[model samples]
Target: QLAQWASTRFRSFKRASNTAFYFNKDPIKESLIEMEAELSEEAIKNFSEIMMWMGDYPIPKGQTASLVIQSIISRGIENHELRDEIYCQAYRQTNKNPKVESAKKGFELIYFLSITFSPSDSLLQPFMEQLMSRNIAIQSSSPQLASLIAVCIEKLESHPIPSYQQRKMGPSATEIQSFRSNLENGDISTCKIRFIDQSTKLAKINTYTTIREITDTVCRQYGISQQSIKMFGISAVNETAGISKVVSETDMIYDVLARWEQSEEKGEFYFQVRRRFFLDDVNKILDQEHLWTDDDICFELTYCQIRDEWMKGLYTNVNEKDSSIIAAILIQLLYPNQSKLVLTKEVVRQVLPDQILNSQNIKVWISMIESQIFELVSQTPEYLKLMFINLIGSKSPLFGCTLFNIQQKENPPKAWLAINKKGVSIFDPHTKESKNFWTFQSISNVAFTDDTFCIMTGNKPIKQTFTTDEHSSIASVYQFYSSQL
Candidate 1:
């Protein structure tokens, strides 16, 4: 039995060494096959070593090497040590030759590895440099690689790398000095700001650029007027970090950007100009002149905003029949050319609310929506979008409301506070039925202390307090709407 065990171990060692030898040879195909056959830690090490060597001395099969490496990494090597080593080697290769095919592959491999592993600053810095350069050659030639690079960057930023030493020593003296000087000088910078219709404007700004200035520039670009500008504001959204807030007009744009940079949060900081205040009537904006370059642009933007609200599934309370009609309008708006028969389950899922989808059979819902779709075939997408908005806006009580989860100081501690153009209202957290409402006219006073929000309403001066994390936003929104009133 001892001899049998010894021979078995001897054979395994021989196989590993042979695989390593094959990995070193010119034929990468044979090497990959051998590596796959073994798939041991030793095999992974050999593969990583060969990749590192190829980074310095270009191999004829460099592309194949990267492809195989990507395949191996994606299949998921369970050994964390091996994975880290592979990641480092891939990073080195990309750093060595960023424009080559192998480098693209290296990026692809790094992206796959980064899915499970947070990249160090060493890996992250170089990748960021490449991204910022916006190399048209790299992006146009390999769109997939471009997308991979973006995804990897977003992933790495979202999950910050652990660093014990860096944490111990905060910002260096030079870093602090540079930041102060930049603020003092108010250096010229440009921001790529997006509008509600998904169009972007590159606005030139500096440290002193006020929120009002940014909003004005955005509105001006879209041909919106001064009166209409009151309804719009710039919002900063970092989806990965789950941070979003409207920039107060009093604050400097530079300050907001500086705060975001200092936060060290992952994900891109997006600046978007959107409708900040909810209107008492959706038709108010629809009826306004020159809200956009054309009426179609206005229609499209409103449709998108309403669609986003509907998709949240929080607002837009409607009966089953009304829901079906809205769903039909959405389908026509989304897929104008496609026949109803071609509309799959996933397509229907996208247009219909989760509540409706869950309650009824999808097939039955699809048929109902299909029948409604037939009547709306002749209409343009813009018209369907408008129709959908009007249908939902008229029916849903909290249609354009910005909602917040709060703890009321009363029975049923949890409730939803909704802020809309009309006023503030409280709704049952579960049922979503409105419990109390206070219009801007009825609201006498509103005050907040950190997490506590207090509102005084009515002739009797009834005051109610609630706890919420979003007290600042609630107060800001309330103040803006009331001032408008």
Candidate 2:
């Protein structure tokens, strides 16, 4: 069944490539010739020929490699021995060719193979080191080559080989090792981290402590599953400058703090672990049993984060009707014991968004919220929280988005540049309406200047520049999301 599926999927790709070569059978022959003896001399010769053809193809080398990989895998001949041979040949090809194009093709083929086959770390480690050495060697002369090699290294380091395989290693052993080393070296320091629940925990960290380590520590402390760790992020905030940045998973806690300290900026610098991704359907969190073992904690954190965003008026232009519903939900969750008649305007104001309070009379809005609250009296706080997140998320353009306030040379002097799973979007600050969006696929390049960041999009590469005091933050966020693509 797997073979059939792969053949069907690559059939069109094979046809397209064949047309480019005027119906040549040589490429197809090289793609299909199965090696009965995996490590035989004949097998090595055939595989090398296939690799050379793929590298020398007039069509995009990566595409050719992709077709060849699928064909080889589908033929039921892909194994450890064959993959090792393929890797060695590709490595040789990369070293043999000094030109950027040939070396790039070699690296591209190896990258595809790495993703398609599950190689043991013993094999991948040397490959990773060679890639790093080559990256440094050509970085100044061929930045494109350097970048491609960097991507390959990142894939090998982070992604599961074969892509679909489950992680074999658990969290405990490595956690203990790091903890022991920190204690023995006496380099440990306590770092305060706030959660979505507004509670804080002091984590033991040092110069080499990564954001991933911090997240793992947070999840273990909260009894949340390590599997869902990707859903959360560590964000650093400087209240004085009004700047907030999501620290990358690979970034060291000490380095981040050092950067802030070196700048000599005067602000309250802190870290918060919060929900990192936005969901289109709230049920994905509320309904999924295996996704979160501690569903209550998950729901609570998600509710709190969404509530905070709504309170900050991030969900802009929420209509009176939706605003009333959200406020009513909050009342039930926040003051469940209090009766509607006893609830004062002052208490209700705390739950209502500033936009809602500014636009409508307090007494009038409280009465509307009171009526909705009474209607929601029977629902549990959990249900109310889920409903609240759903309601606000539906109304929010910035839901599940990381927003940066930036200046553009357009009509709106100030705009919100929001990055999310879908793509990057620019929004009107006042209305919170998305002015423009560019998907990751459309974005060809993102570059930063001293004070401005530019995004080049589309085939013709139209450049859109925005001025920002936090250009590095914007660039990092863009890199974070675009790397996933």
Candidate 3:
């Protein structure tokens, strides 16, 4: 019966007791072959840990290395040390095999490492070192791998809230046909589902198959591992949920679909393949800031959701895995400004020192987040906006005032300058009033002091001096003025 089902388009065969057996012959062969060929100390160790967890399932067939691997990586099942080793094996495999085959093996390997591993997990020193070396090596390979490596390097280095995407459909017509042909029939209990692939192309799938089987099929089809599949449903066009219910991979398709039967027309049922949410009124506040990129905005949204959870614990406790905070950090780096987004940096400073940012492993995580920031701000321009509207809104007073001495002036008269969209306002901190305000529209020539926090502006006495805390802040304010022009 197993052979018959394996030979047919059927993905699973039911036993007399109604236990279903899933078949994924080719994937097991390839992944297992790679596992054997590598003879990796880390990979082997991971395989054992993977097996120990598998004691709960049917003993995986000899070739089912990918499934066994994925089984252990699934949520509520893996350990920190074991996950790092798995990441090492993935990096080693892809790093070794780049330019040899499709070179895409590296892409899938990194994707797997991402979904299986946690941002908060400790003992990433080795993963960090390996990532840096391979990040450089993959640069010369396939453009796909090059693009892929860029994202991977950033992820490991930064440990920021994760940013990844996957497809519900493949690119090739041949591959899409292959995926469809693998599933033969549909009944009253079964139906076809249409979903948008990673490429955003429309694709249809069978609802009778188990989520595990369908996800495994995706892994084989994409040359990726099964850890990254994310399936869910939402009702509104723009909605974010931290506690969003996920359909278990082991659950049968019909059973999962039954839960959402009433949500068919109005609700959005997504078989979205996600790598990985928001605040309330605060999210709407920052929408006006032009500097907010989608990359930062996306991270900020996920950060807030995770942060709210911590506050619920009265700040006494937080995510041990470095889960949401990492995402927030990545967003701030990519969104820094010349005029300076004051609150952005303040929030980052608070979040960084807590275990994740201050850990010895932090350098690697920062590098990882930095890479994605460059990729987004430099390449795609599809970066995230800030999470909360009122929290850091453009509508707010845009303030980052600090005192500085006016060069060549006695006592510097104890002054600070306020940053605003209109222009720089020199203020008497004691009186809390503006001494002089320079609007971009009214300001004349802007000059900088060769190596100090000094800028000269206007035509009368003509605004002779401006001061900031450091030379960099001077440069920042100058740049901000220039940006407005």
Tell how far residue 402 is off in model 1, in angstroms: 3.2
Instruction: Report clash pairs, candidate 1.
Output: 157-266
List TM-scores for all candidates, in order: 0.54, 0.56, 0.25
Between candidates 2 and 3, name the one with more favorable lDDT: 2
Candidate lDDT (C-alpha), each: 0.60, 0.63, 0.38
lDDT of 1 by residue, 202-307 (tens): 7776424567787888777787666667667777877788655666666556545545544567887788887776554656534543343254544455567778
How far off is residue 151 in model 3, in Å? 2.3
Q: Which candidate number would show the highest lDDT if scored against the true structure?
A: 2
Q: After superposition, how far is residue 210 of candidate 2 from its true place, in Å?
A: 2.5
Model 1 spans with C-alpha error above 4 angstroms: 1-187, 196-199, 222-227, 241-243, 257-269, 283-295, 337-343, 353-355, 404-407, 411-415, 428-431, 468-476, 483-485
**1 or 2, greater by TM-score:** 2
- Candidate 3, which segments miss by more than 4 Å at Cα? 1-45, 48-69, 75-77, 95-99, 102-107, 119-126, 157-485
- Supply the TM-score for candidate 1: 0.54
In order of lDDT, best first, we have 2, 1, 3
Model 1 error, position 431 (Å): 4.6
RMSD of each: 18.0, 18.4, 25.3
**TM-score, candidate number 2:** 0.56
Predicted model with the maximum TM-score? 2
